[PDB]
C-alpha cells in the first residue's frame, strides 16, 4: 500500500537485478533456499556477538581515556554512547570528534548529535 | 497502548535475577543496581540483555536514568506500548 | 493478510476449502457501487488468481 | 555355559551381517533425516514468510 514511488523507478541497473531476483525466486528450489537461511541466520547470530564484545571493549577503552582527558576522577561512560553505538546511529566523524572531546576536556556528557538516514542513490535512467 | 505492567515486571526481574546470579526473591521492584552485585560496566550488559529479552530498542536519554527495576520496568513498558504508531 | 500470504506461497493448493461470511450494511444510496464485490476483485488481483 | 556361547556367536555373526549392510542403513538415516527438515513448522514459516 505505501511504497515510496523511489522503489518503483525503471532503471538500466533495475532491469538487471530483475534477473538476479528471478532467478533467486523462480530458478531455485525452496530446499537449497531454506539450507541457505539456515547458514545465514548462524553466521548472523555469530557476527552479532563479535559485534556486541566490540562494542564493550570500546566502552572500556573511552572510560580509561576520558580519566586522562578531565584527568581526575572521572571512569565513567555513557549508557547513551554505548547504546547509540550498538545501534549504528554515528558516523565516523561523530565518534573521532567524541574521542578528541573526551581525551581533552573530558565532558562524558556531551554527544555528538545524530546520524540522519542515508536517503536512496539515483542518478538517471542509469541507476 | 494498553500493556500488561505485571508480565514485563516479572519477566525484567527473571532477566536480572539470571544475568546476576542472584535468586529471584531477593531481586526487588526496587532495588538498585550496585546493590545487587553490579557496577557500571554492567548495568550496560543487562541492558543488552533486556532489549534480546523484548526484542526492543531503548532510548538512550531514558537508559541514562534507570535506577531501579522499576523505572527499567517501565521504560521497557513505554517502548511496548508505542509500537505500532 | 493470512489469505494472500498463503497463495503466494503455494501453500493455499491443499488447505480444506472454508467459508466467509461477508456482511454489508445496506446501501440503497445512488451509487452503483459495492465494496464486496470490490475486495474480492481486489483480492484476486492482487495475487493474480 | 552353552546356550549363551552359542547366542554369543550368532551375536557376532549378525553383527557381520550389519557389517556387510552398513553402508545402505547410513545412507537410508540420511535420507531420512534429509527429509525430516522439510516437514517441521519451520519449513512452513519459511515458506510463508518467502
Ligand atoms: C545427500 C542427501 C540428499 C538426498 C537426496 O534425496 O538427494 C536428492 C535431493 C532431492 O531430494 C528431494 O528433496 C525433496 C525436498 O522436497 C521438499 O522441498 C521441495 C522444495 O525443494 C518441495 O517443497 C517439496 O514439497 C518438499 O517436500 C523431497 O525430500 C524428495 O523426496 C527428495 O527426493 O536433492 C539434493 O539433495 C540437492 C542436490 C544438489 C545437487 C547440486
Ligand atoms: C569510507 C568512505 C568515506 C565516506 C563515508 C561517509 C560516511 C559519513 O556519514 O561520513 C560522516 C560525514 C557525513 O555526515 C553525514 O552527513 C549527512 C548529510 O547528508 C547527514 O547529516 C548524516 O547524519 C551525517 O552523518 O562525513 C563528512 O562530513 C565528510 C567525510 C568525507 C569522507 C570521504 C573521505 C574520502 C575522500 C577522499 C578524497 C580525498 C581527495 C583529496
Ligand atoms: C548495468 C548496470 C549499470 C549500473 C551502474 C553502476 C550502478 C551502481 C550501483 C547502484 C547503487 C545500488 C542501488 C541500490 O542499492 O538499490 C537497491 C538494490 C535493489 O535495487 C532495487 O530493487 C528494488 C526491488 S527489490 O529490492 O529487489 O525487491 C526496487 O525497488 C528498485 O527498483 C531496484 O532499484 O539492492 C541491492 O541489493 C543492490 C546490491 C548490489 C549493488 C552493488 C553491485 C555493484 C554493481
Given amino acids: 500500500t505505501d511504497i515510496p514511488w523511489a522503489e518503483k523507478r525503471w532503471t538500466l541497473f533495475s532491469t538487471v537485478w530483475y534477473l538476479v531476483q528471478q532467478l533467486r525466486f523462480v530458478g531455485t528450489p525452496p530446499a537449497l533456499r531454506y539450507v541457505a537461511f ?39 561512560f555513557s549508557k547513551t554512547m554505548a547504546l547509540r553505538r550498538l545501534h ?35 542518478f538517471f535512467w542509469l541507476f | 497502548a494498553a500493556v500488561d505492567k505485571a508480565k514485563v515486571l516479572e519477566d525484567v526481574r527473571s532477566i ?27 548495568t550496560v550488559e543487562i541492558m543488552m540483555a533486556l532489549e534480546e529479552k523484548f526484542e526492543i530498542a531503548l532510548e538512550e536519554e531514558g537508559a541514562e536514568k534507570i535506577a531501579t527495576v522499576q523505572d527499567a520496568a517501565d521504560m521497557i513498558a513505554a517502548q511496548i506500548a508505542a509500537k505500532g504508531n | 493478510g493470512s489469505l494472500v500470504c498463503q497463495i503466494y506461497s503455494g501453500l493455499f493448493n491443499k488447505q480444506i476449502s472454508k467459508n466467509i461470511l461477508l456482511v454489508n450494511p445496506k446501501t440503497t444510496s445512488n451509487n452503483l457501487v459495492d465494496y464486496n464485490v470490490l475486495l474480492i476483485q481486489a483480492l484476486a488481483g492482487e495475487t493474480e488468481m | 555355559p552353552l546356550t549363551r556361547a552359542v547366542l554369543a556367536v550368532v ?26 527438515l522439510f516437514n517441521s513448522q519451520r519449513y ?7
Fill in chain 4, 11 to 36: 551375536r557376532v555373526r549378525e553383527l557381520l551381517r550389519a557389517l556387510l549392510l552398513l553402508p545402505f542403513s547410513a545412507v537410508g538415516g540420511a535420507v531420512a533425516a534429509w527429509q525430516g
Fill in chain 1, 88 to 122: 549504528w546511529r554515528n558516523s565516523p566523524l561523530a565518534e573521532a570528534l567524541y574521542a578528541l572531546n573526551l581525551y581533552k576536556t573530558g565532558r562524558v556528557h556531551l554527544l555528538p548529535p545524530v546520524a540522519k538516514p542515508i536517503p536512496r542513490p539515483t
Fill in chain 2, 16 to 42: 536480572i535475577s539470571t544475568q546476576l546470579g542472584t535468586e529471584l526473591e531477593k531481586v526487588a521492584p526496587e532495588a538498585k543496581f550496585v546493590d545487587l552485585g553490579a557496577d557500571s560496566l554492567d
Fill in chain 1, 38 to 76: 539456515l547458514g545465514w541466520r548462524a553466521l548472523m547470530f555469530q557476527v552479532y556477538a563479535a559485534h556486541k564484545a566490540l562494542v564493550l571493549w570500546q566502552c572500556k577503552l573511552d572510560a580509561g581515556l576520558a580519566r586522562i582527558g578531565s584527568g581526575g576522577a572521572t571512569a565513567t
Fill in chain 4, 44 to 50: 512452513e514459516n519459511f515458506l510463508m514468510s518467502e
